[PDB]
Design a protein around this ligand. Sequence first.
Ligand code: FDA
Ligand code: NAP
Ligand code: MG
Length: 309
Amino acid sequence: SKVSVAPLHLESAKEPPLNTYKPKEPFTATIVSVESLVGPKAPGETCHIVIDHGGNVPYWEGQSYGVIPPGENPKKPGAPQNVRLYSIASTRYGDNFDGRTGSLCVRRAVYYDPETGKEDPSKNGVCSNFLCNSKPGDKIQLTGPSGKIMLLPEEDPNATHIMIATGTGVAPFRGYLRRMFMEDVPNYRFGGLAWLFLGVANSDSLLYDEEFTSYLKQYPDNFRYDKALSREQKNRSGGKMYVQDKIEEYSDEIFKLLDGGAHIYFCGLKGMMPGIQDTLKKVAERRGESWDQKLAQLKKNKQWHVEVA
Ligand SMILES: Cc1cc2c(cc1C)N(C[C@H](O)[C@H](O)[C@H](O)COP(=O)(O)OP(=O)(O)OC[C@H]1O[C@@H](n3cnc4c(N)ncnc43)[C@H](O)[C@@H]1O)c1[nH]c(=O)[nH]c(=O)c1N2
Ligand SMILES: NC(=O)c1ccc[n+]([C@@H]2O[C@H](COP(=O)([O-])OP(=O)(O)OC[C@H]3O[C@@H](n4cnc5c(N)ncnc54)[C@H](OP(=O)(O)O)[C@@H]3O)[C@@H](O)[C@H]2O)c1
Ligand SMILES: [Mg+2]
């Protein structure tokens, strides 16, 4: 059955926390664990980081933490580094079900010369490698939380939520789905449909696949799960199989759900959105509908939720 969580007073706030800690006086949190999420054939390393905030930096699902990596702003001598934002991949109770930790899902940004393939560590991403290089007991400068675009609408506990992720864009949806299915939250009993679409390079690049597959067996009437493995599968048109191609496979069901009030969420690569728009336009055209008019209505009805970078 569902996992007991504490403390219940995390359900009492009527508004999400915002900017509890600011860049000039961050919260000094402590690393609990860092682990790789991926196998040896993944094109890059993605890690799962558990951070002890001690209850001092609570958040709601869908929000982000800021991390200030150590060192000096290169474009501003004497200044600290700029904040980098990370979508929180845990529920408000965290991976230890106690309200004391939050988790991040972090892709290592690594530079390769585009002609020779030669790596250059000096051009690697600062914060992402700082995080995935961290060890238990290391300190992390935390800011935030921030963000409201990806808060989960809970007014209707039987709503439908269609979740479209590329890579580490899966992060908020891990939190959504643990709250919907894993945790014993008496004041949110989800009875709708949650449908996760996840695009990653290959099987070794899957993120939290065991957890999501377990929801298929535990909640077969409330959860659906489809994967697009871009370097292991090809789409109808001959391109790499992307999430937009998986959406097209279920176009009629998805459009019916949207017409019925479903929420739809997009998180991950900003580059996926032009392809998704192109696919949805083509689907609409085949149905004899205008995607522009449909998208305008979805935005007006607050059904359309995008956070990409
Ligand atoms: C709201 C929101 C939420 C999230 C994210 C963004 C936003 C806006 N991101 C992205 C994250 O904030 C951050 O941008 C990345 O982790 C990269 O930051 P670094 O500090 O590692 O790279 P840094 O900012 O240092 O560098 C940026 C890029 O430039 C490259 N670069 C540096 N010097 C170069 C040079 N001389 N020539 C060419 N290239 C060079 C780096 O290799 C890197 O790819 C994210 N990410 C994630 O993995 N998980 C998440 O959950 C989220 N969540
Ligand atoms: N809240 C947020 O805004 C938020 C949260 C988390 C992450 N992000 C951003 O999302 C990024 C996710 O990157 P990642 O490194 O984890 O993923 P990645 O491995 O670069 O890509 C994930 C999958 O998306 C595919 N893809 C590439 N181009 C695409 C396109 N135009 N349309 C559809 N799919 C496409 C990739 O295929 P190929 O590589 O085979 O082309 C891969 O299969 C992060 O780097 C971060 O910048 C943003
Ligand atoms: Mg794996």
